[PDB]
Amino acid sequence: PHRYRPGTVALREIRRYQKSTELLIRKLPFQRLVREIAQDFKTDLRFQSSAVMALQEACEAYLVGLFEDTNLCAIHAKRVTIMPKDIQLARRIRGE
Amino acid sequence: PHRYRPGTVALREIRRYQKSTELLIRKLPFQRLVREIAQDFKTDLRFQSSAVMALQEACEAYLVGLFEDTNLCAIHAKRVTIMPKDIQLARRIRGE
Amino acid sequence: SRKESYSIYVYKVLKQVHPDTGISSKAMGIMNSFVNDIFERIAGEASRLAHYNKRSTITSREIQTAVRLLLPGELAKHAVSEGTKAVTKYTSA
Amino acid sequence: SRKESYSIYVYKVLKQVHPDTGISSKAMGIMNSFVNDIFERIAGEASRLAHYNKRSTITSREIQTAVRLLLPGELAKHAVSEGTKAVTKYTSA
Amino acid sequence: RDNIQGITKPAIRRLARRGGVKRISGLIYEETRGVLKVFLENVIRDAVTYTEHAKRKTVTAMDVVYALKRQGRTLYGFGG
Amino acid sequence: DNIQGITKPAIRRLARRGGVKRISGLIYEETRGVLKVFLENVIRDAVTYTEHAKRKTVTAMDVVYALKRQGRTLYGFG
Amino acid sequence: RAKAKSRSSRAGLQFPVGRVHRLLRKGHYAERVGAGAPVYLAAVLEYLTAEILELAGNAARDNKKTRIIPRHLQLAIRNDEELNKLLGGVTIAQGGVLPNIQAVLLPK
DNA sequence: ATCGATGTATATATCTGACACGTGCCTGGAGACTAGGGAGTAATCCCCTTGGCGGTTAAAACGCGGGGGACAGCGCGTACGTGCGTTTAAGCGGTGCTAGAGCTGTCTACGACCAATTGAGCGGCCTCGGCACCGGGATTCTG
DNA sequence: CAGAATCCCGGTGCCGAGGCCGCTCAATTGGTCGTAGACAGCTCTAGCACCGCTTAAACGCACGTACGCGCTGTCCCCCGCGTTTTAACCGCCAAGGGGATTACTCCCTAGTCTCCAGGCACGTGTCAGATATATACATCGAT
């Protein structure tokens, strides 16, 4: 049967998701996580339907930016696969 | 004869200059450089004696921080010698 | 209650630049946020510049200096000309 | 003419923490600018909180919220404790 | 609780794909989850602080906008 | 052309304070360019504040404000 | 006309409550300023000053010195995890750096 | 199988000049009285908030055949370090000049605060045409 | 280079943007007069320039050993594809806590006027500090 070689699909996905615009994290799991973390500070809090979307958009933008930076650090070592030390370096240089 | 092995004087220099606090750039050449750059914006400018010192302290603190960062991104590549691409990479990740 | 916005003015400008093109509600919301953002940055810097000189009134000179400090070179180069022309015409009226 | 700095109050406090040590003019200059920095941050944040709620006055509630926002977790607990002690003693004086 | 497991592996893969990463090592997921938790905690603490100052019980979108604004990132499209 | 006044020994000393053990021979021209670019952005601002006040003498306060706007608050010069 | 006594004495503070109150009104932060804002802010500033001076004074004895200088302040700030977070961006003149060498650079 | 030479450290001797207490004095701060509107409080309307059940495939999960990306190793050549030598202009001490920043005094143009009016804008409703979802096709590009 | 994945066009079809009337309350014209912003006239400090002797630092050159780099082996682990499982997901239905408002009403503040004592300069003196001396010994190296 026809089979694509490793990475061809990855590039096709990169093009697809770079050209698209919808959100990628599931709404319900994130909503439950937001309500869970808030529980340590104050109980019985209430959240608007748009606040959860705002938090999801902020998190997706932050993570995408961190992955973009991590890729440069990965290429610099002549590797292609990103690894945890690369993330730690990016965060250290950014001063996080 | 007697002769120290390469790098031991460097380490002694590191321990020396990390302990001291004096300025390392020559005052008069730096003053002339400041005088030369300001001339492109306005003529007959005057500088207080303390202004050049403030600029020198800021420049040395900036170079020191940039070199500290460049060393980290240099070791990360399994090298010890800093090179231009390390400065360019540090500045790129720093967003400058 | 009544809520104010810059939406009608953004629409008038759009109609002057491209009469045939239209704008969605999301774009109107973005433009309505962007205008307040830049407004606060310029008014803030003009306020700081006023105190360092012990002046009690903000004038066009403070705005021109703040604009030159905040905006990059070419944008400042054009915007200063626009403001100068506008102020000249307004004063001549 | 007459200048203004906090070097006197820094000296009074220094003689309370360590009554046998002195401080050079170079350290005094840094301590004098540090106070002006923290003062400006707290007053700035307190003014923003007061404006968002549409209030005309700044009160201890604004100071407390700003302090909880600007200072790290551990400094805030102690600072707030002694601030409330001071306010309580003043109001009860 | 187990809700941290709700950020499944495929969501992380799609996010990494958007950034152009071609190959990802299997250990990146736990680091990403840890990195996300501290950011959410930091933003929510400020949001809840603003909510508590107003004596409200519901957390509104404005409080999140101001939290992000203080951390140094500005969000356009939800208000302000 | 006074950029040559930042001599090689000074660059080595700065790299030493930062903990650099070995330095490649090409770092000097890049460092010169970086320093020139850093200085230009501060000097333009200092001159801007000087001109707004209609003064002809650049003062320490002008540099203090210029650095603070970029986020590099400097303590010590009043 | 009773004999006047300073507000700083009543609160038990060293900083000048009157001067802080004046600086708030002249800063245009708001059109009205309540009575409790300056007492609380003065107490906070006194606390932070005392903590900095205490740490610097302890650092001075470790060098058999009797007078505080900028190097001791730098060593005090960069060595405390709380102060370092508040002052991560501030630059102190004549402070120098802390001694630190990466283990990869030390001799084999 | 081990010993010592350079450099940092340290200790004793010496004078310099910055830190600290003083007096005189001036204008910021605290005491006393007042008027008003920002704020605190209760009652109400009603929306949009939390909670539940139906049911269908989108999305996730677990296996797995396997090849390509990763590191650990060897061989090596020329780029950078430590040191010696020559000389450069960096360093410092002093005398002079005056550009130009900071203070005193007079002065009148500009702005904030009031009375009165009215149409630019905000709100709810109508409506019709641009995007959306579908389906069928040629084409691109790849293993 | 066979063929799987892609773009594109014609059709059916539906609710968002665009237009409208009601009507109010934000903005405007005209008016006043208090103090801030404008200038010249003047004081005296310090930035700029040159003189000169000395030398701390710099430019330059030799050479040798240590690092950066290219090819290699080979393997073990992320990828691409298949079948089974699940809860998200739209949608319809309840009902009431909280949010937004009017209305009352009171106490906390900004303002004027007084006056004194806190702290801002000019005067100084002595003892905390740095410079100049010799020597101990650790490390890194050679033997």
**Domain extents in chain E:** 1-80
In angstroms, the CA C82 to CA A73 distance is: 44
Q: Which of B15, B58, B64 sits opposite G97 (nearest CB)?
A: B64
Q: Are D88 and D60 in contact (CB under 8 A)?
A: no
Maximum distance among all alpha carbons in chain E?
49
In angstroms, the CA E76 to CA E63 distance is: 14
Q: Which of residues 24-63 of A touch strand I (CB under 7 A)?
A: 26-29, 46
Q: How many residues does chain G have?
A: 108
Look up the CATH architecture of domain E1-80.
Orthogonal Bundle (1.10)
Strand, helix or coil for residue D68: helix
C18-42 burial: b if 16+ Cβ within 10 Å, else e: eeeeeeeeeebbebbbeeeeeeeeb
User: Any chain F CB within 8 A of the CB of C49?
Assistant: yes
In angstroms, the CA G20 to CA G41 distance is: 8
DSSP D29-50: HHHHHHHHHHHHHHHHHHHHHH
CA of F10 to C1' of H90 (A): 14
Query: Judging by beta carbons within 10 Å of its beta carbon (0-12, 13-18, 19+), is residue C82 exposed, middle or buried?
Result: exposed
Q: Which two tokens stand for residue G108?
A: 């084999």
Which of E62, E17, E66, E67 shows the shortest CA–CA distance to E39?
E67
Q: Are D71 and D41 in contact (CB under 8 A)?
A: no
Question: Is A81 within 8 Å of E25 when comparing Cβ atoms?
Answer: yes
Is strand H in 7 Å reach of the CB of B81? yes
Q: Are F77 and B50 in contact (CB under 8 A)?
A: yes
Q: Which of residues 58-77 of B touch strand H (CB under 7 A)?
A: none
CA of G68 to C1' of H16 (A): 20
Which superfamily does C1-93 belong to? Histone, subunit A (1.10.20.10)
Handedness of CA C61, C65, C70, C74 (dihedral sign): positive
In angstroms, the CA A29 to CA G18 distance is: 54
Q: Which of F73, F77, F78 sits opposite D37 (nearest CB)?
A: F73
Which bases of strand H have any atom within 7 Å of the beta carbon of a protein residue?
A: 5-8, 18-20, 27-32, 38-39, 49-50, 59-61, 68-71, 79-83, 89-91, 100-103, 111, 121-123, 142-143
E strands in chain B:
46-47, 81-82
Is strand I in 7 Å reach of the CB of G1? yes
Q: Which two tokens stand for residue B73?
A: 């991104």
Handedness of CA G84, G87, G90, G95 (dihedral sign): negative
Which of D73, A21, D18, F73 shows the shortest CA–CA distance to B61?
F73
Residues C9/C11/C16/C17 CA torsion (nearest 10 deg): 120
Q: Which two tokens stand for residue F45?
A: 């601002």
Which of A86, G45, G96, G37 shows the shortest CA–CA distance to B60?
G96
In angstroms, the CA F55 to CA F61 distance is: 13
Q: Which of C53, C68, C69 sits opposite F53 (nearest CB)?
A: C53
Which residues from F are below 8 Å from C when comparing CB atoms? 45, 48, 52-53, 61, 65, 69
Radius of gyration in angstroms for the set of CA atoms belonging to chain E, rounded to a whole number: 16
Q: Are A92 and A70 in contact (CB under 8 A)?
A: no
The β-bridge partners of A46 are E58
Q: List CB contacts of C6: < 8 A, sequence separation 6 or more.
A: C31, C32, C35
Element (H, E) at F49: helix F27-52
Residue C89 phi/psi, 5-degree rounding, is -65, -45
Q: Which two tokens stand for residue E67?
A: 């939290």
Tokens 């405390």 label which residue?
G80
Q: List CB contacts of C31: < 8 A, sequence separation 6 or more.
A: C6, C7, C10
In angstroms, the CA C56 to CA D40 distance is: 20
Q: Are C58 and C47 in contact (CB under 8 A)?
A: yes
In angstroms, the CA E50 to CA E68 distance is: 12
Q: Are C37 and E74 in contact (CB under 8 A)?
A: yes
Opening angle at CA A78, ends A72 and A79, nearest 5: 80
In angstroms, the CA C65 to CA C45 distance is: 9
Indicate the residue type of C50.
Answer: A
Tokens 């200092």 label which residue?
F46
Q: Which two tokens stand for residue D10?
A: 């820094």
Chain C residues whose CB is inside 8 A of the E78 CB are 29
CA–CA distance from E34 to each of A83, B13, E30 (Å)? 15, 40, 6
Q: Are D14 and D23 in contact (CB under 8 A)?
A: yes
Q: Are strands G67-68 and D22-23 parallel, antiparallel or unpaired?
A: parallel
E strands in F5-69:
22-23, 57-58
Q: List CB contacts of A45: < 8 A, sequence separation 6 or more.
A: A35, A38, A39, E48, E51, E57, E58, E59
In angstroms, the CA G16 to CA D8 distance is: 11
CA–CA distance from A33 to each of A41, A50, G76 (Å)? 14, 15, 40
Q: Are G56 and G80 in contact (CB under 8 A)?
A: no
Chain F residues whose CB is inside 8 A of the B57 CB are 74
Strand, helix or coil for residue C14: helix
DSSP G29-63: S-SEE-SHHHHHHHHHHHHHHHHHHHHHHHHHHTT
User: Any chain F CB within 8 A of the CB of C61?
Assistant: yes
Alpha helices in C5-71 (DSSP H): 7-17, 25-52, 60-70
Q: For F64, which residue in chain G has the nearest alpha carbon?
A: G91
CA–CA distance from F78 to each of D27, D35, D36, F58, G100 (Å)? 12, 12, 10, 15, 30
Chain D residues whose CB is inside 8 A of the E53 CB are 49, 53, 61, 65
In angstroms, the CA D6 to CA D12 distance is: 10
Q: Which two tokens stand for residue B43?
A: 């003529």
Strand, helix or coil for residue E75: coil
Task: Report how far Cα F74 is from the mean position of its chain's Cα atoms.
Answer: 13
DSSP B4: P
Phi-psi region of C90 (alpha: psi -120 to 50; beta: other; left: phi over 0): alpha
Q: Are strands F57-58 and B81-82 parallel, antiparallel or unpaired?
A: unpaired
Which bases of strand I have any atom within 7 Å of the beta carbon of a protein residue?
A: 3-6, 16-18, 25-26, 36-38, 46-48, 57-59, 64-69, 77-82, 87-89, 98-101, 108-110, 115-121, 128-129, 140-142
In angstroms, the CA F11 to CA G17 distance is: 49
How many CB atoms are closer than 10 A to CB E14?
16
Element (H, E) at C2: none
Strand, helix or coil for residue B5: coil
List chain D domain ranges.
Answer: 1-93
How many CB atoms are closer than 10 A to CB C8?
8
Helix-helix angle D7-17:D25-52, to 10 degrees: 110
Which of B76, B67, G97 shows the shortest CA–CA distance to F21?
B67
Query: Resolution to 1 decimal, in Å?
Result: 3.9
Q: Are F43 and B38 in contact (CB under 8 A)?
A: yes
In angstroms, the CA F6 to CA B33 distance is: 9
In angstroms, the CA F78 to CA F64 distance is: 8
Helix-helix angle G36-61:D73-92, to 10 degrees: 130
Which residues from E are below 8 Å from D when comparing CB atoms? 46, 49, 53-54, 66, 70
> Does 1.10.20.10 match the CATH number of domain F1-78?
yes
Indicate the residue type of B42.
Answer: K
Q: Are strands E58-59 and B46-47 parallel, antiparallel or unpaired?
A: unpaired
DSSP A4-73: PPTTHHHHHHHHHHHH--S--S-HHHHHHHHHHHHTTT-SS-EE-HHHHHHHHHHHHHHHHHHHHHHHHH
